[PDB]
């Protein structure tokens, strides 16, 4: 059959052999720094779900160096506090997984510092809530930043000492998100909000439906369920997932393969190349929570069936292997952006998204 653990490791090896920079303790300095954080999450999640620890030394090197005050944002004072709330949020969630893997209070403390940094740009005076993404400009409360923050406070509500204040913040944050309008008529999440020129009220800006904006919210609702034992959160998550799996909504191909909207025009940029893996890994948390929340053995079978279907398509259609040489004995797998289309080339955001799908099936 298909050993997702073996292919995850081969993909991580391929990510490392092509894109990891030993001298910089980071993958691909020419790609968005926040995608290095996503990559770290995938490697941590692989280790956490497979029981292996083969990349734990490497992960710890990356943390120690990216922990330092950023050259492009020294006012953050390190600990991943960067020039945007979504930048910070990706690394914050990686530290939560780091904590889950190791149990070291140190990583949890980074997440606590990051929550407090992000909340600095939560304002109740515009849109009745939510935080801005552009720390320097304060012109956009989008979906990804508030989804990341929501999943952070919901995670802290399950792990941090003053867990109650985080439960209050997460419940208050989910209420704002739900009533914000970003969840549209088919239970998908548009990119962000826009503000009325004359009235100051906000509305769904009808910008694209990105796959990672339907994933991160699922993890937040799963964490909100673990902290409250309220299945209504799982039900809300399940509706967002169900809309994604529905081919009528354009996210799922006629072959049952997840497809970013830019894949058609072949115009997926550095950011959008990683979106799919973020959704898959989050849907795996939904499927796991759903299967355990009920005695039914078929609970979440469709989410697992979906991830499996997508894995075999990416394995057969999107895969390419590195050429070993007399000097470089490094082996592994490389992956392009389309989980059904051909393999043209591999980039770090595409590779990280491939790892996410394999880890989602581990
Ligand atoms: O490509 C769709 C997104 O494009 C814009 O943001 C790009 C990325 O910039 C940030 O630094 C990262 O943290 C990412 O989270 C973010 O996607 C925004 O318009 C965003 O809302 C779009 O979804
Ligand atoms: O993501 C890469 C990261 O490093 C660059 O040097 C800066 O311009 C940042 O604004 C950017 O976010
Ligand atoms: O339209 C919503 C939003 O779209 C853009 O991506 C942002 O740069 C903002 O200027 C604007 O408010």
Numbering used by the authors: 78 to 439
Give the original sentences from the paper that presented this experimental model.
Notably, our structural characterization by X-ray crystallography combined with glycan fragment screening indicated that CtGH76 can recognize GPI-anchors like members of the Dfg5 subfamily but shows a broader promiscuity toward other glycans with central α1,6-mannobiose motifs due to the presence of an elongated glycan-binding canyon. Compared to other GH76 orthologs, our findings demonstrate that CtGH76 features an elongated glycan-binding canyon, adept at accommodating a wider range of complex glycans.
For the active-site mutants D164N and D163N, soaking with α1,6-mannotriose resulted in α1,6-mannobiose binding to subsites −1/−2, alongside with single mannose residues at subsites +3 and −4. However, occupancy of subsite −1 is observed only in the active-site mutants, with slight variations in orientation. For the α1,6-mannobiose complex, the subsite −2 displays a highly conserved binding mode for the mannose moiety, with interactions mediated by a conserved aspartate residue (CtGH76: D268; CtDfg5: D250) that engages the 3- and 4-hydroxyls of mannose. Similarly, subsite −1 features stacking interactions between the mannose pyranose ring and a conserved aromatic residue (CtGH76: W111; CtDfg5: W83). Firstly, CtGH76 favors the β-anomer of the mannose 1-hydroxyl, whereas CtDfg5 prefers the α-anomer. Secondly, the mannosyl moiety in CtDfg5 adopts a regular 4C1 boat conformation, while in CtGH76, the pyranose ring is distorted into an OS2-like conformation.
